[model samples]
Target: AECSVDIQGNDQMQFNTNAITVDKSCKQFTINLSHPGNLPKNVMGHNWVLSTAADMQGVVTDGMASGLDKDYLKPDDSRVIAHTKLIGSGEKDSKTFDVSKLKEGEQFMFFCTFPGHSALMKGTLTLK
Candidate 1:
């Protein structure tokens, strides 16, 4: 089977996992995101976005201004490595990307760029 993982977001503004590891042998990896909150997307939506730590803040800040139609992300933003679509309660989304995009010893992070969600929804990812 291909390497993949399932992560979750909830009404409390939290991610179920704090870190993810990508095996060096894999050419690609996948993240499956789900939100179980009861609130509507406009009220409490979630999406998974990956980028280098150095670029996270800028991408997120710009995303906040990008508007909901853009899935809270800057359209065609080069800094984004991969991302899943915004999802609401009981909704799910997934993103798959080439593992070669990750570099050892570099800092990469995944978070929901939904306004203030990143303050509590961020996590680390490493290449192993």
Candidate 2:
């Protein structure tokens, strides 16, 4: 089973890869995020946030007040499984999560919590 994957976020509020499979055999998993566009973080920043599908909106709603300085995420948010730091064009970030966090039949999702970006940047993750 693969232990890591790479995802790209462009200036257009889109993710190059949608959907991911997490193998239950692995003890840890990692996701690498890259931005190749020209826009700065303020204009088109990106981050990778993980949570249960049911918790997605609430996490985003509560994170709005955190702003870019906090990577648009509330401090010590228990709902977030893991996340990368907010980044701009030409930047890269990564986050590692324990495979144990994933359950066989649970629904999980990943998105960028930069205000409205979540509307277009969200995708599903499932255990394989």
Candidate 3:
């Protein structure tokens, strides 16, 4: 398809997919995220964050401290390649990143950085 990937987040703490492949020719990529729940942000907010698979845990831990005001992400965190703003029930957000940042043979990942959501809403992102 010629459009960007669309991902869905649910109240059950699950992402619609666990893996995605990016076409090598793409100069830029976008992640369109949405939360379809009815809960408040403090109760079930979610965000889409990208980083090296190896650094996922640490990044998420630090992001937790970054607070919800910053969308649960560390400010200018280099390990974070790209990410979407945190969204609550009925809200949506998206982020675009240069595809050139992706490298072959490296493990890339995406997940929700909201407190405990990372454990379930994480996924592998690959450029092939």
lDDT of each: 0.92, 0.92, 0.88
Name the TM-score of candidate 1: 0.96
Task: Summarize candidate 1's per-residue lDDT along 12-88 as a digit string, tens digits.
Answer: 99999989888878899999999978988887999999999999999899999998888899988999999999999
Looking at candidate 3, what is the lDDT of residue 70? 84
Give the per-residue Cα lDDT of candidate 3 at 76: 82
Number of clashing residue pairs in every model?
Answer: 0, 0, 0
Total backbone collisions, model 2: 0
- Candidate 1 stretches with Cα past 4 Å from truth are none
User: Candidate 1 — which pairs collide?
Assistant: none
What does each candidate score in C-alpha RMSD? 1.1, 0.8, 1.2
lDDT of 3 by residue, 1-128 (tens): 34279999989998999997888888888889988888888879989889989989988999999888888888888898888888889999988889889987787999999999988999999888
- Which ranges in model 2 have alpha carbons more than 4 Å from their true place? none
Better of 2 and 3 by TM-score: 2
Task: Give the per-residue Cα lDDT of candidate 3 at 106.
Answer: 80
Global lDDT of model 2: 0.92
For residue 38, what is the lDDT in candidate 2? 94
